[PDB]
Amino acid sequence: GISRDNWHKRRKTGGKRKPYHKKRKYELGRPAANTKIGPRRIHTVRVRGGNKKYRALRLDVGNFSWGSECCTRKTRIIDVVYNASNNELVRTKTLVKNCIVLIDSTPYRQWYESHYALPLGRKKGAKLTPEEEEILNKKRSKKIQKKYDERKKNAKISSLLEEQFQQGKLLACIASRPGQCGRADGYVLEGKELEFYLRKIKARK
Amino acid sequence: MKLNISFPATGCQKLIEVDDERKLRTFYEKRMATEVAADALGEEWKGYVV
Amino acid sequence: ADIQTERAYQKQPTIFQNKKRVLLGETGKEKLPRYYKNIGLGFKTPKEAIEGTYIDKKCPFTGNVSIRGRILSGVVTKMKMQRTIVIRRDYLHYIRKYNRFEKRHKNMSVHLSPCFRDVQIGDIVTVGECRPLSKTVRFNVLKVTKAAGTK
Amino acid sequence: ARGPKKHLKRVAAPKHWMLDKLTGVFAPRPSTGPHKLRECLPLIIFLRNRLKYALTGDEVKKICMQRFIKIDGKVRTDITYPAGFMDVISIDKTGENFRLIYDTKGRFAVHRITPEEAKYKLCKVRKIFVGTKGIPHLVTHDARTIRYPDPLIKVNDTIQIDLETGKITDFIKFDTGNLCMVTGGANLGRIGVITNRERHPGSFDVVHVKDANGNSFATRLSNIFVIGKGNKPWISLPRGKGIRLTIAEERDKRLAAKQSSG
RNA sequence: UCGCUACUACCGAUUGGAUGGUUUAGUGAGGCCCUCGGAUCGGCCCCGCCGGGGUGCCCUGGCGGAGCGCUGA
RNA sequence: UGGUGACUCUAGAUAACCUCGGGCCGAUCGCACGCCGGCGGCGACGACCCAUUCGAACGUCUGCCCUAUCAACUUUCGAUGGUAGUCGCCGUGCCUACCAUGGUGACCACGGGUGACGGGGAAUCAGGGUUCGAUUCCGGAGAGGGAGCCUGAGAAACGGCUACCACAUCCAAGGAAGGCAGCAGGCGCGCAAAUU
RNA sequence: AAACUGCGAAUGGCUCAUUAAAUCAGUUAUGGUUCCUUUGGUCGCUCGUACUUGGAUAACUGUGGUAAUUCU
């Protein structure tokens, strides 16, 4: 069927070859898994040597890493935005590797607030909840509060990251091939890479 | 149209040769595995369902 | 940005650029640590690769390629297509009925890294064998030596 | 071919097997095993062709299925089993022990050893790596995986293995001044002392070896098997003692023998 | 030169026929992949006939009926 | 920790993940019978992984007959390269999107022909040379012609399946079944080749 | 005997149509891949009815269909 042979092409000089054998099985290709957004659907494929691949057809959640903080968590993928390969893959909402997607932020917002004991992502409207205040303002012993206070000196986040935490969704890049391993893992964008990706999203509008 | 009839609670079996049109009307326009009260098959089939 | 002329952000995969250290580090200087390797068969890594800022993954010193196989040499003939060059190898073939030779040549396409700047089409280049980098490219430039009209 | 091959033609068999042209069309294809197909002696060509304990290939099977032959301490009932260099063959019924050692002509010799010498073998080192939880692992020329070895043992060395337990009892490093045998190429079966090793990075090394009579030759580093430390071998040697005679010397030594007879 | 005999190669109106190979456009079997679909086959529930044990309740065994119940193939 | 000429290698640490079309962590079998109700000795069959053997698959450098009454060829429909991805066992225009305009050629490219499978080799022979190699060994290809698949470690398998094209078999006319370039054998073709 | 299960049937044998840097030969590389089987290692490393678990289906018995098949 779909083949990945080299003898159907032209020679370097531009000359047409003549094949000497027919299509073999070590040369085959398979249809693409255009992984969409939805509740999980995965089909197993038997591959050379008797092994298996995982064609993910729909994905809803994935493992994503906040690299600066070293915080990797499961998070619900929301929406598909600018794609570096094809801008047609964004209208159909297709997940592939090195794609720019939106993810939820609450698993990260909980770890930051439970580790630095500071409120991040709270809007300026005085949103206080007894569970949240027990997370934040619970009274610790002398040594525990000392260890928390010596930690607040470097508990600072950039201005581009904290804006996203206001709207509850972060921007992430999927570093895994979802149509080969069946899962969408990746890293949240930061720094100059986030600066670069925020320009070309605005340049598409 | 002959009928293979088996009674699973005893194990007895026989083929009955039927050349009538009224008995086959009930079985017509029906699918497999449909339990239907075949009462027109004979006098002993009054309470039998197949 | 000159370094960022493509649709996808260009970086060295081994290097992590988002180490949140301190406000002073932001104040001090923003220069990324660079990944360079020692492609080694007696060859030396040019200093334009340790101090450069180009991003190319098919470079031997600062990319993901391994040099193994044959070490060859040639003369640069054409520099026209992006980031790769065409070189010429001239040899003598022996015809034994006449006990004589004849000149033959081969044209070979090699990959040129940005660490090798100021190279013109007259000069001798050493090339090392690597994995298939494209349809008709299997070698990579390892050393550049100026031609007869050396300045 | 759509898969692996299962036959071997007699003219395509390794020449040192010494197979004649007109016995058959086929030769025993060695089973997969610790030794390579072209560097091994199958059990049938040793029991039938060399020792002549059997006249046909059906008789080799009758000897094997009685569980009489042990290859390095284990009974093998496969009649095409790939025995090879430094292996020990034990027949307990007749009380015989043999070691597979090349002779000067490049062919495996019928070298009988004592029951004490059959308790160990010498193995080259092919690979050293570290496995999970930091455990060092060896791989030898006999396809033996031996873990927790000494850290002084490196690749191209030789170790001594006790065949009952399979553990290292001693080792010899690779260095100039050590005895060795050539196990391939054009000097196969020759014994001499290492004198030099020239290194060619990115390619094959070359080792220079000098005989006891003063003849010097060279081989590739992969064809060198360190036998003993210094001039003293660690195993018993065949009749020729590893010295390659010239054709004229061999002719004179053969002619002198028949004059002695009378 | 003119006259008589034979055979080859060529031109040639007939937009010659036979055989085979290339392609434009359209149609297009069959397998494979994806999205649906759901003939049938169970299980856990609900009632009816009912034994045992523990203590009106639960665990059970033969089941029959039926419910736009849920779940699986 | 260890090693390479050279790792983005092996080993290590940390935060998580772990596919229901699902990942390993033994409800299997035989023979001898025993020691102090417990403990057990030889094997057989299975197991993710690592290494090894048998390979296979992709690439590197050099090398082939005649032909110019074939001198320019490739690039719309991937041609040379770049970036990101899809697919693939993997490296790669293998394929897609966006870019750049490249790549080969009288040192004979491109096209055509071959009574062209390629070597190890054979005949002739002062020395040089000329011609042959379908043929029992090694490699390739095919199973009437194309194409597509299932199973499996491995096949685009044909003494497997599914279609189409060409032939052809039995029939109650509804249907069913095909593949000798395997060993014999028959027809045909021929100057030309053996026993069902 | 039969039948279920496992393995093999991808080797061998034949032929030379295709095929002109293609095939192939010497030389190299996989640090760019897979590998049934043989041989060796591993197989209480995991802190969460077991003195044995569940439902079928062949062979067999019985009733059959078709002009016809290694059909069912």
From Swiss-Prot, chain A:
The modification Phosphoserine is found at S159. Residues 7-25 have a biased composition (Basic residues). It is found in: Cytoplasm; Membrane; Nucleus, Nucleolus. There is a cross-link at K169, K192 (Glycyl lysine isopeptide (Lys-Gly) (interchain with G-Cter in SUMO2)). It is a lipid-anchor. The keyword Transit peptide does not apply. PROSITE patterns: RIBOSOMAL_S8E. Its main location: cytoplasm. Residues 1-26 are annotated as: Disordered. A lipid is attached at G1 (N-myristoyl glycine). GO terms for cellular component: cytoplasm; cytosol; cytosolic ribosome; cytosolic small ribosomal subunit; endoplasmic reticulum; extracellular exosome; focal adhesion; membrane. It holds the Pfam family Ribosomal_S8e. One of its GO terms (biological process) is translation. The modification Phosphothreonine is found at T129. Keywords: Acetylation, Cytoplasm, Isopeptide bond, Lipoprotein, Membrane, Myristate, Nucleus, Phosphoprotein, Ribonucleoprotein, Ribosomal protein, Ubl conjugation. GO terms for molecular function: RNA binding; structural constituent of ribosome. The modification N6-acetyllysine is found at K36, K127. Component of the small ribosomal subunit. Identified in a IGF2BP1-dependent mRNP granule complex containing untranslated mRNAs. Part of the small subunit (SSU) processome, composed of more than 70 proteins and the RNA chaperone small nucleolar RNA (snoRNA) U3. Belongs to the eukaryotic ribosomal protein eS8 family. PANTHER family: 40S RIBOSOMAL PROTEIN S8. This is Small ribosomal subunit protein eS8. It comes from Homo sapiens. The lineage of its organism: Eukaryota, Metazoa, Chordata, Craniata, Vertebrata. The gene is RPS8.
UniProtKB/Swiss-Prot annotation, chain B:
Ribosomal protein S6 is the major substrate of protein kinases in eukaryote ribosomes. The phosphorylation is stimulated by growth factors, tumor promoting agents, and mitogens. It is dephosphorylated at growth arrest. Mono-ADP-ribosylation at Glu-35 by PARP16 inhibits polysome assembly and mRNA loading, thereby inhibiting protein translation. The modification ADP-ribosyl glutamic acid is found at E35. It is found in: Cytoplasm; Nucleus, Nucleolus. There is a cross-link at K14 (Glycyl lysine isopeptide (Lys-Gly) (interchain with G-Cter in SUMO2)). Transmembrane segments: none annotated. Belongs to the eukaryotic ribosomal protein eS6 family. Component of the 40S small ribosomal subunit. Plays an important role in controlling cell growth and proliferation through the selective translation of particular classes of mRNA. Part of the small subunit (SSU) processome, first precursor of the small eukaryotic ribosomal subunit. Component of the small ribosomal subunit. Part of the small subunit (SSU) processome, composed of more than 70 proteins and the RNA chaperone small nucleolar RNA (snoRNA) U3. This is Small ribosomal subunit protein eS6. It comes from Homo sapiens. The lineage of its organism: Eukaryota, Metazoa, Chordata, Craniata, Vertebrata.
From Swiss-Prot, chain C:
It is found in: Cytoplasm; Nucleus, Nucleolus. Changing C59S: Abolishes S-acylation. Pfam families: Ribosomal_S17 (PF00366), Ribosomal_S17_N (PF16205). Keywords: Acetylation, Citrullination, Cytoplasm, Lipoprotein, Methylation, Nucleus, Palmitate, Phosphoprotein, Ribonucleoprotein, Ribosomal protein, RNA-binding, rRNA-binding. A lipid is attached at C59 (S-palmitoyl cysteine). The modification N6-acetyllysine is found at K37, K44, K57. The modification Omega-N-methylarginine is found at R68. Signal peptide: none annotated. Component of the small ribosomal subunit. The ribosome is a large ribonucleoprotein complex responsible for the synthesis of proteins in the cell. Part of the small subunit (SSU) processome, first precursor of the small eukaryotic ribosomal subunit. During the assembly of the SSU processome in the nucleolus, many ribosome biogenesis factors, an RNA chaperone and ribosomal proteins associate with the nascent pre-rRNA and work in concert to generate RNA folding, modifications, rearrangements and cleavage as well as targeted degradation of pre-ribosomal RNA by the RNA exosome. Component of the small ribosomal subunit. Part of the small subunit (SSU) processome, composed of more than 70 proteins and the RNA chaperone small nucleolar RNA (snoRNA) U3. This is Small ribosomal subunit protein uS17. The gene is RPS11.
Swiss-Prot record, chain D:
InterPro entries: KOW, Rib_uL2_dom2, Ribosomal_eS4, Ribosomal_eS4_C, Ribosomal_eS4_central_region, Ribosomal_eS4_central_sf, Ribosomal_eS4_KOW, Ribosomal_eS4_N. GO terms for molecular function: RNA binding; rRNA binding; structural constituent of ribosome. The modification N6-acetyllysine is found at K232. Pfam families: 40S_S4_C (PF16121), KOW (PF00467), Ribosomal_S4e (PF00900), RS4NT (PF08071). One of its GO terms (biological process) is translation. GO terms for cellular component: cytoplasmic ribonucleoprotein granule; cytosol; cytosolic ribosome; cytosolic small ribosomal subunit; extracellular exosome; focal adhesion; membrane; nucleolus. Gene3D superfamilies: 2.30.30.30, 2.40.50.740, RNA-binding S4 domain (3.10.290.10). Coiled coil: none annotated. Keywords: Acetylation, Cytoplasm, Isopeptide bond, Nucleus, Ribonucleoprotein, Ribosomal protein, RNA-binding, rRNA-binding, Ubl conjugation. Component of the small ribosomal subunit. Part of the small subunit (SSU) processome, composed of more than 70 proteins and the RNA chaperone small nucleolar RNA (snoRNA) U3. Identified in a IGF2BP1-dependent mRNP granule complex containing untranslated mRNAs. Belongs to the eukaryotic ribosomal protein eS4 family. PANTHER family: 30S/40S RIBOSOMAL PROTEIN S4, SMALL RIBOSOMAL SUBUNIT PROTEIN ES4. This is Small ribosomal subunit protein eS4, X isoform. It comes from Homo sapiens.
